[PDB]
Amino acid sequence: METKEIFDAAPLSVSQFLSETGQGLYIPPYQRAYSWELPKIRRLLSDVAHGLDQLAEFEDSICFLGTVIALRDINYTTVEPKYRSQVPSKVMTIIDGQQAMTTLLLLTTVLHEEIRVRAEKLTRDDEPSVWCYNQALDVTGRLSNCFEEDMRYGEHRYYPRLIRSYYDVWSRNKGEARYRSPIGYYLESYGAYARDPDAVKPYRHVPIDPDKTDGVDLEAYRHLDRMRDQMRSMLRKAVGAGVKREDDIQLPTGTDIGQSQNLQFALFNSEFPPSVVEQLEDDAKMTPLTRLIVFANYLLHRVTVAVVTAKREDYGFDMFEALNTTGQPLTAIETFKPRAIKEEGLDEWQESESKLHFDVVEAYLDREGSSSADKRQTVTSSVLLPFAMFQDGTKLTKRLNDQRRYLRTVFDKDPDIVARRKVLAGLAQVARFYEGPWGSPTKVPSCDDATLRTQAGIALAALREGGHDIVVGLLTRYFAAHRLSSPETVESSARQFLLAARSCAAFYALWRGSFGSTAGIDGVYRSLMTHVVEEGMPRFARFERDLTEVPPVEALQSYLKEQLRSEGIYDKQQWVARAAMTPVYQHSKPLTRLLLLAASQNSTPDSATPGLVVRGKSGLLETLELERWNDEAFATIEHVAPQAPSSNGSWNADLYEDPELINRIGNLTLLPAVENASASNRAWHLKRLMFRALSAATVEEAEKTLADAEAQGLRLGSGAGEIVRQARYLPLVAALAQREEEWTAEFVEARSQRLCSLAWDALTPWLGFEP
Amino acid sequence: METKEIFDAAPLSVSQFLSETGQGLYIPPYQRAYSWELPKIRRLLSDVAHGLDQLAEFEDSICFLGTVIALRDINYTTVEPKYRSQVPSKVMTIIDGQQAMTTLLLLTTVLHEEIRVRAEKLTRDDEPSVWCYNQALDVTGRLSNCFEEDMRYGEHRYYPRLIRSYYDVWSRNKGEARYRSPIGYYLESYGAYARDPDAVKPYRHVPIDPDKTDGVDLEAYRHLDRMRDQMRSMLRKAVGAGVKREDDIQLPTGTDIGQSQNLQFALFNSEFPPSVVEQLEDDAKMTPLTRLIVFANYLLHRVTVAVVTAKREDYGFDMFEALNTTGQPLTAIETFKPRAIKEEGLDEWQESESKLHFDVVEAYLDREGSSSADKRQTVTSSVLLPFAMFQDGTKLTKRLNDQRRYLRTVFDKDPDIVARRKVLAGLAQVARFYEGPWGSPTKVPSCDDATLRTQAGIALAALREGGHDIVVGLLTRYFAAHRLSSPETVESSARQFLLAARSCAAFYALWRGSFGSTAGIDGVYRSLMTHVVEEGMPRFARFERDLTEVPPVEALQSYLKEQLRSEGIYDKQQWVARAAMTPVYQHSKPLTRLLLLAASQNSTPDSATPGLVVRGKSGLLETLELERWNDEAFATIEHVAPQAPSSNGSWNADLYEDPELINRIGNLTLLPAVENASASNRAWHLKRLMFRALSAATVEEAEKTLADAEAQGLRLGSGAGEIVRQARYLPLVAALAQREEEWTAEFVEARSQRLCSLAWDALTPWLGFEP
Amino acid sequence: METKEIFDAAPLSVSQFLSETGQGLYIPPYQRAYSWELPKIRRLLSDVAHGLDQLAEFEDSICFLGTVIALRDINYTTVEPKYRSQVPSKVMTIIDGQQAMTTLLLLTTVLHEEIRVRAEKLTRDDEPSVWCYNQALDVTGRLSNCFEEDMRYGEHRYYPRLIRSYYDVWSRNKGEARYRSPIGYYLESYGAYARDPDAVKPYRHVPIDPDKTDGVDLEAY
C-alpha cells in the first residue's frame, strides 16, 4: 500500500478505447444528462480536423482529446439495474468525461452513416473507385465494432457502449433488455439501422417513446438527437459545396490527401495507388467520400484520450478532485520567451534589443491582460493573429499548441540574429499599434493633411468597432514603416499609412455593404498578403525581408479593386443594386453608421423628391471625420418605421411582408439625442414631427415646432430630453421632415437606393477608383 | 504510433517521488516564480493533517496531493546552463505542479528542522525516550535525503532538488555550481545547516546576495523565505501551546496516536511498545515530538502525488491542456441520491416518501444554487453542515469526501427504512427552514402572541446577518415539530420554536458581547446537541428517534444558562464588566445593532446625568420587533467620536489611548437617514448639533435647529439629505443632545456601562433568567 | 482475474535492481546452499566482461545476466524468524536465481575492495590521478549501497541484502539481529570492513564460528 494500484493511466486511440473486445462504457447513476451545446461540439470536430490537417505537415503530431477517469467496476456493483447472467466482462463506470464520450460515439455514428451511403453511390468498376469502395468498407466495419459489440446470441444480440444506469440494461436475452437512455436508445436504433440488409438509404431516426419512457425529460432526447444530426450536417457540409463559411470544419482536400505521403502511411499503412492520387487531384465524384474516410481514420487511430482507471469508487472520486486542481497553462508567448533568451546571444541579455521588444509585448500583455488568466490568453491571441498576418501571412488559430508551434517556426526561420530580433520587433510594433490608434484613434500618426488625419481616424475607429481585425495585420505592417524610415521619409510613411487606413475602411464598407457578411474578406486579405506583387521586387506583408521596406502605398488599392471585380461587383449600378437590398442594421451597426456618414457627406435636402438627399456643396459639412464618428451630436441609428409594431400603432404594412425592409439604409438616419430611452419615437406622424423638430434654421421655429409636437405628446417620458434650443444641422432628417405623403415601402426602396449611391460616390475615391 | 509512450503516469508517495536515488527535479525557464500565498499553504498542511486524522479511523484511506506533469528530459535538452559531466542522471523538468513541489520541499525542510532539534532535547536514558529518539533519527534522515542528494565527491558534493533554469547549475565542482534561485538557495543552505556537526540550534537563515544575484526580484527570496518560516511556525503552533485558534492545523494528540493500532502499523509497520503509549497518553514532554514525527511519516509515505511523464516537451504541454479540461466534480448530495434510490425499496420509487424529501432538497439546491457550479457546492454545504448538527450532532467539514462519508454513515445506521427515510426527512426539513424564516424572517410560524412573532423575527433576522449559523441545527430541529404535530399541539410547537429563536439571539447577544469571539459557542452548541438530557426520555438533537418528538421547549434555556456560568460570567455586574470593554463595532455590526435595540427598549433620555438613558415605560415604543430591525428609521451605527480624525478636527485624544474605545457601545447610537453619505459628521459640536436636530419634539424646534446647525453647516455635501420636517423618536439621540461638557473617555465608559446594563436587563428575560 | 497480476516482469540493471532504496532480498528456507563451482563464476565474469568489450563497438549492445523469479512478500509471511518492528519495508524472497544473486553481491564486494584499496594508493595530486580518485569514490559508494543498506539507527545499523531464512534476521537492534548464513555473514563482515575508518588495507576475512554455527555445514562457509 503506497502505489498499491490506487490508479492507472494510459493513452489510447479512440479505436483502442472504444472497440475493446469485451468492454462496456457505463454512465453511473449520478451523472447529469447530455449537455454540450453545439459550440463545444464544433470545437471538438474542428480540433480533430486541425490535428489531421497538421498531420500532413508533421508526420508524428498526435492530437489529444482529454481525459476519461473511470471505475473498473469488477464486481458490477455500480451497474444498478443489472443481469449478472450476462453483463459485459469489463464494465467501466465513467466518472468524468462521460460527456465527451457520448459525443464521440455519436460522431462515429454519423461518420459511419455517411461513409456507408456515399460508398454505395460508388461505381464499383473503375479500379480507383473499387479501392475507395474497399477502404470505405474497412472504416465502416471499424466504426461498427466501435459503437456496438456483437455478443453472440439472442434477440438484442448487439450491445451499445455508453448506457446510463436506470434507463438501459445490457442483456442479450429477449425479455429484460432495455436501451432507453438518450445515448442508449440512439446507439441501439442507429446500430439496428446499420444492420438493415437492403439498406443504403441515409439514416432517418424514429425518436423513442412510442408510448412510454418519461424516466428522462423528453427534452434530453430532443437535445441528443439534435446534436447527432447537426454533426451529421457539419461533416456533410465540410466536404461538399463551395459556400465554405468561416467556421465550418476544414478538412484537407482531394489534392491535399493525394499528395501527402505521410498522411497516407500513417492512416492507411501504405502509399496510395497512383490512379487514386490522380482521381483525387481534381475531386472527381469520389473525393468527398475519400475525404470522409481519411477524416474517419484519423479519428480512429490518431486522436487519443487519456484513460485513468481506479479500482475503488471513492479513489476515483478523490482522483477527479485531484485533477480538477491542476494549474494554469501559459500563453504561447510565455513558453516561447526561453527560445529567444537562448539566442541573445547566450544568457547575457538585459540591454539587448530583444529584451526591449519583449518588454514591449510583455507590458501590453500585463496591462490589458492581468485581470484574469484566460483574459491574458485572449489578449495574447489578439496580438498573435495580427502578427501572423504581419510577419508571415498565415491564419493563426485560437488553440494553444498552434501559437506555440507557429511562434517556434517563425522565430527559427532566419537562424541568425538581427533578423530574428526583427521578427520580435514585429510583435512589439503590433502591441504599440494597439496602443496608438486603437486605444483612442486620435493619435493615428502626425503629418499635416489635417483632413487626412481625422479621415483615416474615422477609418480606424470604424474598423475597430465592428470586427475586422483581419486588417490589423496590414495596418501594423504600415504603422511599422512610419517609425522605421530615414528621418526624411517620415511624411511619405505617414501618408501611405493614412491612405491604407482609409482604403481598408472603404473596402470594408463596400464588401460588407453589398454582401451580407464577412464572407470572403478574411481570406481575400490573406491572399493579398501572400500574392506576388511586381515580379520579385517585394511581397505584400513583410515576409522575412526587412520591416521598413515594402509594399508601396497603393498596391493595396489596385489589388482590392481588381478583386472588387471578380465576385465583388464595383460599378455603382451593380454595387448600389446589391447594397440597397441588404439589411445593414442586422449586420454591423457601425457599418451602417459609416454608410450613413458617407451618404451625407456635405449633403443637402432634395427638393425635387421630398425625402431624398443630394450632394454638391464640396465642403458644406463633411462628415467623414473622426471627430464626427464619436460626435454624439448625431449618433443614434433611428429607424423611420420601427421594428416593433406588435398591434400596429398604425403604419403601412407594405413595409413588413419582407422583414428585411425595416433594416435597410433607406429606413435609417442618424438622430441626435434620444434613441428609445429619454424622449423618442411613435407612429409615422409623431415621427415626422420628431424629425421636423430637429431641422429648423431659426429658434422662432425650433420653439414653435417643439410646441407643435407637444400637442400629440412630443415631451414623452417627462418633458423632452435635451430638447429646448437645439441648433445642429442634419441633412438626412431635413429631407425626411419634408416628406408628407406616407411611409411607403417603395419609398424606402428608392431612398436606400439614393443613400447607397451617395455613399458609394463618397467613398470609392478611397480605393482611388478607375477600375 | 498509437500509445507510443506519448505519456506515462503513476502514483507515488511523496517519499518515493522525491527521494529516488538519481533524480533531479528541474523548474524550466518559463515557470513563474514561487506564487502560493499562505492560505494555500495552510490548505496543504491541513489536507495532509486531515489525511492522518482520517487514517486513524479508516486504516486504508489514502490521501492525495494533486498532479505533477514533467518531461523526462533524456538528452538534457532543457537544463539550460549545464555541465553534462555531471548533470544528474535523471532530470524531470516539471511542466506543471512545480509550485506544489516547491512547497513540499520547504515542508520537508521544516519537519526535519523541528524533529531534529526537539529530538536533541530528548533525555536518551528512559526506554520510551530512546524509542522516540531512534524513531526521530529514522524520519530525520529520510526527510534529509528527500530534499538533497549525496553525489559523492568535491566541494558542492551535495545536490538540491528543484533548481529553476538560468539561475542554478547542478554540479559538484569547485567553481561552477550555483544555487541562486529562491529554492535552489534555500535547499542548499538548509541542507548545509543540517550537515553542520556541532549544530542542534534551530535554523536561523541568511538570505542570499552577500553582494549579488540580481537576475531575480529580491522579493522572490522574501516571499519564499517567509513562507518557509511560517510553515515552520504553523507546525510549531500545532503541537505546542494551548491557544488553539479556529484554524491552526489539527493533528492527533499523544493519546490519539498512542491508542490507534492502525496509525502505528501503517506508519511504523508495527505496534508501539507500551511504555511509549503510556508516556504518550499524557503528552509528557515527548509527545509533541511524536506528533511531529507521525505527521512527517504520514507526509512521507501516505501522501501520494500523481506523476505524469512525457518524453517530448510538446506532448507535455498538450497533456497539460488535456488535463485542464477535467469536468466539474459533483456535490455530495448528487453522488448520494443513488444510494437511497436503492433502498426505496428497489428501483420502483416515484411516489415513495424519500422522493418527496429529495425533491425538497433538490429544489432548494436548484433554486439558490444554479448560477454557477462552486456556488452549487457552496449551497450544498450550507444545507449539509446544519444537517450534520440536526440528525447527528457533528461538525462536518467543507470538504467533499467528508460530506460523502457522513451522508453514507448517517443514512446507513438504522438499516431498515422509515428509520432511513426519516434520516432523509431531516435534510428536507433543513431546506425548508432555510425557506421559511431565513429568506424573509417575517414568516416565522403561526400562533398568536403577536409579540412573540416579531420578537423571534428580530431574533432570526439578527442571527442571520452576522454569522452565527451554528444555531441552524437547533432551530430546524424545532421548526420540524411545528409542521409535525397532532393538530391540537400546533400552538405548543409554534411557541417552543419562537422562544427557541429568542433564546439563541439572547445567548448570542450575550456571548460575543462579553467575550471577544465565538470562542466556545460552536463547541457549546455541539455539546448541547450531544449531551444526554433527562436520562432516557429523549436526546437534544433528533438522533434516530422520531422527528415530531423532543426535546422540550425550555431545556435550551436551562443548559444555556448553566453554561453561561463556567467560563461565561452572567451576573449583570460581571457581564457588564466584560461587555463595557469589548469593541463590539470591531466584531459583528449586527451584534451592535442587537445590543443597541435591546438597550433602548422603551428607553428614555436620562436627566440626572446629561446623556445617559433610563428605562421604565413598559410600552413606550418597544424596539425588539422584526418590524424594527429593517426599520431604516433608526438604522445607522453612528460613532459619537469618529474613527477618522487623522489631524484632529479637534476632539479629545482621551478616547484614543486605546484603539478599542472608539468602538464600544458608549460611542455608538442608532441614527436615521445619513451615515457619512448624504449630509454628515464633523467635530464634537457639529456632532452635538446633528444630534440636537433629530430630537426635536416640535416643528418650531425642528426648523429652528436645522437652521442653527447650517450656520456651522449641517447641510454638508449639498443641502442636508432627507432633512426637513422629521418627526421620529430616537430616545438615545436626545440624551446625547443633552450632554454639553465635552466627550470624555470617562463618560464614554460610564455610558457604555449604562447601555450594557440596560440591554442585559432587556434580554436576559429571553432565557427566562433566574440563574 | 485473467491477468489480475498473476506475475510481473521487467528488466533492471544490477544497480537499480540491488540498490532499491528500501528492499531486502531473502533466500527462502528450501533453497539449497551456495553451489556454483568456480567455472560458473568464471563464465559469469567473462560474460559481463565480453558485454563490456562489445559496448565499445556497438554503442547500444546491452548485456543480460539471466533471470530472477521472486515473491514480493507483502505481509512478510516467508521471513521465518522475523522482527516485524523493523523488517525491511519491501522483501523479495527469491524463488529462482538466488545463486546468480549470491554471486553478484559477492562480485560487488570484491570490486569494491579492489577499487577502494587501489584508489588509496593514488597520489592525489596529479590531475588524472585526482580525476581517478573521485571516480573511484563515486563507484566505491555506489557499490556499497549496492550490498548493504543504512537503516538509520542502532548497532547492526546496516542491513545486508540476501539473507536465507532460519539463519539471519534483519533487525537493527542490539540483541535480536543475526547473520550466520554463508552470505549473510560475508556481507555483514565485508560491510563492517568497508566502513572501517583507518583501513585501506586489503580485506582479510575472519570466518565465523568463533565458537558456534553448525546450523549449516561449515563446508558451505
Side-chain angles (χ1 to χ4, degrees), chain B residues 690-710:
Chain B
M690 155 171 300
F691 296 160
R692 262 140 224 175
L694 307 93
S695 36
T698 48
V699 201
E700 253 167 334
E701 281 185 14
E703 305 176 351
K704 287 191 180 175
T705 36
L706 170 56
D708 263 14
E710 291 168 21

Side-chain angles (χ1 to χ4, degrees), chain C residues 87-111:
Chain C
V87 86
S89 100
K90 170 194 186 174
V91 319
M92 295 270 302
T93 53
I94 299 196
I95 294 184
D96 180 64
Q98 45 94 197
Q99 223 138 116
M101 280 345 182
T102 277
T103 313
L104 249 189
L105 276 310
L106 253 39
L107 182 53
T108 90
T109 256
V110 19
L111 270 159

Side-chain angles (χ1 to χ4, degrees), chain A residues 1-13 15-16 29-32 59-62 64-67 69 78 80-81 96 98 166 300-302 304-307 312-315 317-330 334-339 341-342 347 350 366 376 399-401 404-405, chain B residues 1-13 15-16 29-32 60-62 64-67 69 78 80-81 96 99 166-167 214 300-302 304-307 312-315 317-330 334-339 341-342 347 366 376 399-401 404-405:
Chain A
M1 179 46 141
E2 212 142 329
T3 148
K4 215 206 192 157
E5 82 84 24
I6 311 172
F7 101 111
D8 164 18
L12 322 168
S13 70
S15 180
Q16 43 205 20
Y30 37 75
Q31 287 316 330
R32 354 195 75 106
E59 326 156 342
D60 63 52
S61 129
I62 216 122
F64 249 88
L65 228 208
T67 323
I69 319 177
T78 45
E80 290 276 359
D96 181 62
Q98 50 96 208
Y166 301 162
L300 277 182
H301 308 328
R302 284 261 187 153
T304 92
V305 327
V307 184
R312 277 137 103 305
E313 188 173 45
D314 65 77
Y315 286 127
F317 284 150
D318 291 340
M319 290 230 60
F320 201 173
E321 235 167 324
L323 269 35
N324 205 34
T325 59
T326 194
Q328 355 69 244
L330 298 167
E334 279 146 326
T335 105
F336 168 101
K337 179 141 312 186
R339 262 71 82 172
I341 301 192
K342 270 298 96 110
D347 212 307
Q350 250 276 348
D366 293 302
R376 186 180 194 78
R399 35 188 55 109
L400 246 335
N401 43 285
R404 213 170 282 120
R405 181 167 281 108
Chain B
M1 181 46 140
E2 212 141 327
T3 115
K4 212 211 189 160
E5 83 85 23
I6 318 168
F7 93 168
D8 163 13
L12 329 175
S13 76
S15 183
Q16 42 206 19
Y30 45 75
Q31 290 324 336
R32 333 202 73 101
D60 61 57
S61 127
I62 215 109
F64 247 84
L65 223 231
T67 320
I69 325 175
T78 52
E80 285 271 357
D96 179 63
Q99 241 161 55
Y166 298 162
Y167 349 126
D214 201 16
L300 278 182
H301 308 331
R302 283 259 183 162
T304 80
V305 330
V307 172
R312 263 133 118 290
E313 190 173 48
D314 56 77
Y315 289 137
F317 284 142
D318 287 337
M319 285 224 56
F320 196 179
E321 235 170 328
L323 272 36
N324 210 43
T325 63
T326 188
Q328 354 84 226
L330 295 167
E334 279 143 326
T335 107
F336 170 67
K337 177 136 313 178
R339 265 76 91 172
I341 304 187
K342 267 313 107 36
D347 207 307
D366 294 305
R376 184 174 187 76
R399 26 177 51 112
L400 254 305
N401 44 286
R404 222 173 285 123
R405 179 172 279 104

Side-chain angles (χ1 to χ4, degrees), chain B residues 127-128 131 258 264 271-281 286:
Chain B
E127 207 280 24
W131 169 96
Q264 308 173 0
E271 255 203 327
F272 279 28
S275 30
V276 172
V277 301
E278 209 187 8
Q279 265 251 45
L280 260 25
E281 198 169 288
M286 92 169 213

